């Protein structure tokens, strides 16, 4: 049936995620991150590379300054913005963006301006066709198969929970924090420098991540966990550096992501994610709470955590009423279930009339984006 391949961008705080709306997985996935030369270029005219985006910015980042365009979900430098979709269409697709539709994602609440700005420089830079900007909560619902429930979504640079009804989202009783992976990473890299290591330095972060992302774990049970881990040695895991050599880690295992629960932990007085999803449901409207609470999707790299479930089930049932049927589903790929989502959407028949045509923005500006989107 589709004429032309829609094209599906998911920007990231940390990683950004491109592909063909059809596919059941993105084609490309890369750190949102653009370099330049840290030392200054000898000659003049000879264009030489100025700018170093994703991978190759990483494969370089010695000799460079790296910049992140995306801070807490919310795109900070446009200069920079515009060169990862340049990159993205041009260098890792290898698509001419003028050839295709593409819907493109960004975080709820956002600032007004920035809605604006994305869908001008798709239709007066890139010269794309048609064009949309959806939420990614709202994909990743929809991914799962759903068109009601909420959406805790906890990605690189912010965390969101997103109640959705039957299909739309309800704009009030969304909720942020700003507590997310990058948090995480930094405390993980703290806690284990107290251990006795000795990781400060951004090279090592990177280290720390793998650690994280594959030694980490929720446990349903914090103090009786610290406990075991105290007189037990039976919480403790393995990990060797580039060097070879090996490093056992402990409660710091659970202790990381444990921030998830316990802002404070950081210094932070914001709610963990289990009492923002509960006072997200509570924002809502009491007729459909009983949903919601059946309904919880996880969604986005954080909560990938092992164990990140069964400790949401039993924290939201304390605090929802006792006959209050509780229920949370974590998508195996949710990692790229925003993606996934927008692939799905963009191939739906009733969203066709949602894009954004070069005509309607040719007519009605900018501000076309709100009517459309919102
Ligand atoms: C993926 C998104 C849009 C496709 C809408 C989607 C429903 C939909 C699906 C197919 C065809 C038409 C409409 N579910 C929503 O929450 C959206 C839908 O947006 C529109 C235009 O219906 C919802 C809008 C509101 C006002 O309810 C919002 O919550 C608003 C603040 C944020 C935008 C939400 C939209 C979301 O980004
Ligand atoms: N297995 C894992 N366990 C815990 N954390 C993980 C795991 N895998 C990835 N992460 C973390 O998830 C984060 C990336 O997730 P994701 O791509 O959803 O965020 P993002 O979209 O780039 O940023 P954001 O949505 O906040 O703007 C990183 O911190 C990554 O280290
Ligand atoms: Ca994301
Ligand atoms: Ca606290």
Aim: proline fraction near 5%; charge should be negative; include cysteine.
């Amino acid at each position: 049936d589709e004429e032309v391949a829609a094209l599906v961008v998911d920007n990231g705080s940390g990683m950004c995620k491109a592909g063909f709306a059809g596919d059941d997985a993105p084609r490309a996935v890369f750190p949102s991150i653009v370099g330049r030369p840290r030392h200054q270029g000898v000659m003049v005219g000879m264009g030489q590379k100025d700018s170093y985006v994703g991978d190759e910015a990483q494969s370089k980042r010695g000799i460079l300054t790296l910049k992140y365009p995306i801070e807490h979900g919310i795109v900070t430098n446009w200069d920079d913005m515009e060169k990862i979709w340049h990159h993205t269409f041009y260098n890792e697709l290898r698509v001419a963006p003028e050839e295709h539709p593409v819907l493109l994602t960004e975080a709820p609440l956002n600032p007004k301006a920035n809605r604006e700005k994305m869908t001008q420089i798709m239709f007066e830079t890139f010269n794309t066709p048609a064009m949309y900007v959806a939420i990614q909560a709202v994909l990743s619902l929809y991914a799962s198969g759903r068109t009601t429930g909420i959406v805790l979504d906890s990605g690189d640079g912010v965390s969101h929970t997103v109640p959705i009804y039957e299909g739309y989202a309800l704009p009030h009783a969304i909720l942020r924090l700003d507590l997310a992976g990058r948090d995480l990473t930094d405390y993980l890299m703290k806690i284990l420098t107290e251990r006795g290591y000795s990781f400060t330095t951004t090279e090592e972060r990177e280290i720390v991540r793998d650690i994280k992302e594959k030694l980490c774990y929720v446990a349903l049970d914090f103090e009786q966990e610290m406990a075991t881990a105290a007189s037990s040695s039976s919480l403790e895991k393995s990990y060797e550096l580039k060097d070879g050599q090996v490093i056992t880690i402990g409660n710091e295992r659970f202790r990381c992501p444990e921030a998830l629960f316990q802002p404070s932990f950081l210094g932070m007085e914001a709610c963990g994610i289990h009492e923002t999803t509960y006072n997200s449901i509570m924002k809502c409207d009491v007729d459909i709470r009983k949903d919601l609470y059946a309904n919880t999707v996880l969604s986005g790299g954080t909560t990938m955590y092992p164990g990140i479930a069964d400790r949401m089930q039993k924290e939201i049932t304390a605090l929802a009423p006792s006959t209050m049927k509780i229920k949370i589903i974590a998508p195996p790929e949710r990692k790229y279930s925003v993606w996934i989502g927008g692939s799905i959407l963009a191939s739906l028949s009733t969203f066709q009339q949602m894009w954004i045509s070069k005509q309607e923005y040719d007519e009605s500006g900018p501000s076309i984006v709100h009517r459309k989107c919102f």
